[PDB]
Design a protein around this nucleic acid. Structure first.
Ligand SMILES: Nc1ncnc2c1ncn2[C@@H]1O[C@H](COP(=O)(O)O)[C@@H](O)[C@H]1O
Ligand SMILES: Nc1ncnc2c1ncn2[C@@H]1O[C@H](COP(=O)(O)O)[C@@H](O)[C@H]1O
Ligand SMILES: N[C@@H](Cc1ccc(O)cc1)C(=O)O
Ligand SMILES: N[C@@H](Cc1ccc(O)cc1)C(=O)O
Ligand SMILES: [Mg+2]
Ligand SMILES: [Mg+2]
Lengths: 428, 428
RNA sequence: GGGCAGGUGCCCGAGUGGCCAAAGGGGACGGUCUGUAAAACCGUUGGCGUAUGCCUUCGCUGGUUCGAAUCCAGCCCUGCCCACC
RNA sequence: GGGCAGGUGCCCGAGUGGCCAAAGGGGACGGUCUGUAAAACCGUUGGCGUAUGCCUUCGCUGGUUCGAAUCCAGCCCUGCCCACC
């Protein structure tokens, strides 16, 4: 067990801000399970490692005995959180969010404990649909226009002449009322959620509730190296991606992001992180990719993604990435495939596509149209352009003839770029 | 009967703006009773001649066969229309507005026809209370922040650092939704209502309705000569004030307001108004005061407050105010009292106040405390100050001794200023 | 409700009758080099099976012109400015 | 959530330890003059029945001081600036 001070110190690790920090300490001394809120608007399906930053911290709360309330923003997602936005969000239907919501519920359990005393799922439509005009008037009366416009995206858009739809100013009051509805002790979020979390405190005060602690985590940067990991930016690693693909993507995280990936996605000690960085960028990537590929290949990540877990998998810490043959089978194969492809090899397991003979012309298929039929190129023009840039291979050889007519009398291995492969064959 | 063109020309008289004017002409050619909307938030009891400006125009619509829908803003009045406001309005309870609402319903009929085919009363709580959060989101999505802040009071307050409560930006959508609820063809208002009326058009378009014509009347200036007549400014003449008081107040309208009072409150022709102004300010006041004192002494004003009506009362147009002995008894007495008081006389009918002998000190009452007991002064200090300024009279003589101890062995006539009188006497 | 400007490619954004699948910057994509990284460098960034060609393309719908992303008109939406004060 | 400034009389607003029931402007109120108007001019704009006095008074609650509208602290609310990007 932990004392309240020990609890707070553990929870602080990796956090950007706990505010008011003294209030979390005081709540931790109450000797009761705290209600820890996280909302997520399912505007697109699937969770990624950026979501894992806040969810892993919530798992830490659960391992300390506190209760997570995961709010599916089926109602709020219809609106669109303008936080950080450069322009107004497109609306979605309640049915749209609830289809995406199914993935969130299924995937959240890959990180969160699911025992009821530690976890409860809510849909904010449960209470937001019945909120009446009079109540909305009284809620919005709690803040002024000048106060609302302080939020960075409102200030910048207004000063630049970029439209702000008035309904965007109602969204924070929905999120904040959610905290009243579930009597939140703590609200989790990335740093981008800071303003809405603070409105939560204001609305709770107005409803006579203790104002929640706002618990802010730093944002994981995406694979591009600059922007926050997000679905819209197509720079993300999904929690349910096959180990093969997760391992490859983690190996390609830009080197300057390694410390934050270790701090936000693992529990390694600071000296352990420095030790991996001493070994060098590639060894450090191998350990990161092994830890997380293994953890997310499990049905649920362990309570600690630490050195002990690493060795649990069969790896040796003092090998610093050299022991490639160790580990869970799924991870070992993923790393083996990564290295085989890196050296110019073709993996043995590659997707298969059968081409109907009705596509043949003079008994063959023009190479450009063949790659579009295989799903590797969006258009024949693009296939031609990739050939001009030496981006396509046929049975391992770089294509130099954009007019090549390909013989499919036997299966052929098509390759686009570094590691997209398809074997094509014919069928009547 | 009137043609649509004749109808529009009549309705234009006195109006500041009909917009789109061509749309009113087209509605008038439809050959059906148009729904003519007026909302009024009963934030204080009683209607005044400023309200009469818009209500008389509505009466004109009714006399042309169109249907008034008078909306009591029992719900909106709880919020507070920020239009023209220098600061945020104080909220009221639904019970508060509905007590004030009783006066509005009773007094509106002094101007409006009350036959159902010409008149229907609604309370906007009828439909606004059931408006749901989702619907409010969709309503507010119809306008942006920059669009909302164009309204003069929002722009000036925001640029000056004067707070605007966010709920003030919801009010126009309530007023506008009211137009959807009753399918308004026309919305009436003073010029101060222009922005909210135009939002009405936008919301009607979004609900697939023909957008209402916005019918704007100029604001009647109050007795102070500068500000719009309003209860808050204490510069108004109430529709139900006794003829005695209405006549006196109309005689004291500043001379530069006479043309607008004739144009907005009577139907006299422009050449008739000039003819009265030629007679001089006082004659012109006598005719104005007679016309309106008579009209509002009736249970309902006539369809035309014109020269024919004037002569109907027994006055002679070519006497230009000299025939003081003519007219309804109530008006003749009011004018007689006005002139008697002007020449320093005391009227025969004056309020009576009985003072209990328990107020006596050495068998008398200090003059200052006597005026406070009579209701003429708010405090003895103020009575003393008024004596120093020669503002109080006792039995017609100007009081010069602020220490006077008044003998009440017989009734005494107290006077404050020009025309506030009270007769005081004793009782055990 | 009135005026003016604007909406363009993955994003921002230039166009300023033809030189436009479209400047410049960013991004993304391919390659060299490697470490399936970065940087640097070169290239690509509507579609079409015979191409000196065909189809589609700058908010929507039309119009003038041999030719419109560009000019005109109606309409939608936005910003600024009016109106309201 | 952090900082700074602010809330004063009917309104705006000055105060800058005592000279404060409180500058200045507006408004309102009384009077002269009249037209029960305006303008101009003079005056008034916390309360109290013996006044060289008593009571209350500058967002709320306390505090320092002989004395606080003024200085200090906690709290409420606002504006600007942070945070968020
Ligand atoms: N890349 C990220 N790093 C850390 N937290 C994130 C990231 N992306 C989303 N979140 C958090 O996950 C929640 C849902 O975010 P979103 O998916 O953007 O609606 C919010 O609390 C976010 O701050
Ligand atoms: N002095 C006035 N002159 C003309 N119309 C007025 C006046 N006062 C109020 N109204 C109109 O009466 C309606 C209610 O106004 P209010 O009493 O200010 O809530 C609105 O349409 C106003 O424009
Ligand atoms: N605003 C959060 C979602 C959310 C929804 C409801 C809440 O109560 C809290 C958060 C997001 O952008 O994903
Ligand atoms: N806004 C109007 C009242 C009103 C209420 C409802 C309406 O639908 C229209 C007008 C006022 O200030 O008095
Ligand atoms: Mg406009
Ligand atoms: Mg703040």
């Amino acid at each position: 067990g932990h004392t309240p001070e020990e609890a707070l110190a553990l929870l602080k690790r990796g956090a950007e801000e706990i505010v008011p920090e003294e209030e979390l300490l005081a709540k931790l001394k109450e000797g009761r399970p705290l209600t820890v809120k996280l909302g997520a608007d399912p505007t697109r399906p699937d969770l990624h490692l950026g979501h894992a930053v806040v969810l892993r911290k919530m798992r830490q709360f659960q391992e300390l005995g506190h209760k997570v309330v995961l709010i599916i923003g089926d109602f709020t997602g219809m609106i669109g959180d303008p936080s950080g936005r450069s322009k107004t969000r497109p609306p979605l239907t309640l049915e749209e969010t609830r289809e995406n919501a199914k993935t969130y519920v299924a995937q959240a359990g890959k990180i969160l404990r699911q025992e009821p005393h530690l976890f409860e799922l809510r849909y904010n439509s449960e209470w937001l649909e019945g909120l009446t005009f009079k109540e909305v008037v009284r809620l919005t009366s709690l803040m002024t226009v000048a106060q609302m416009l302080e939020r960075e995206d409102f200030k910048k858009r207004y000063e630049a002449g970029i439209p702000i739809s008035l309904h965007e100013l109602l969204y924070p009051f929905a999120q904040a009322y959610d905290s009243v509805a579930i009597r939140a002790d703590v609200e989790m979020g990335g740093t981008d959620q800071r303003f809405n979390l603070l409105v939560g405190r204001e609305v709770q005060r107005a409803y006579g509730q203790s104002p929640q602690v706002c618990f802010l985590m730093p944002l994981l940067v995406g694979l591009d190296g600059r922007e926050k990991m997000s679905k819209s930016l197509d720079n993300y690693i999904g929690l349910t991606e096959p180990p093969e693909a997760m391992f490859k993507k983690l190996m390609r995280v830009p080197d300057p992001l390694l410390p934050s990936y270790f701090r936000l996605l693992t529990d390694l000690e600071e000296e352990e992180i420095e030790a991996l960085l001493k070994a060098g960028p590639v060894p450090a990537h191998r350990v990161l990719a092994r830890l997380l590929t293994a953890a997310y290949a499990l049905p649920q990540i362990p309570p600690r993604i630490d050195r002990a877990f690493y060795e649990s998998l069969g790896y040796a810490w003092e090998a610093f990435g050299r022991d490639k043959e160790a580990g869970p089978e799924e991870v070992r194969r993923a790393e083996a495939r990564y290295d085989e492809v890196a050296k110019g090899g073709i993996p043995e397991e590659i997707p298969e596509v059968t081409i109907p003979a009705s596509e043949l012309k003079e008994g063959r298929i023009w190479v450009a149209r063949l790659f579009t039929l295989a799903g590797l190129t969006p258009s024949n023009a693009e296939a031609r352009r990739l050939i001009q840039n030496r981006g396509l291979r046929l049975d391992g050889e770089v294509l130099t003839d954009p007019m090549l007519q390909v013989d499919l009398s036997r299966p052929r291995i098509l390759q686009r770029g570094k590691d997209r492969f398809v074997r094509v064959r014919l069928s009547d």
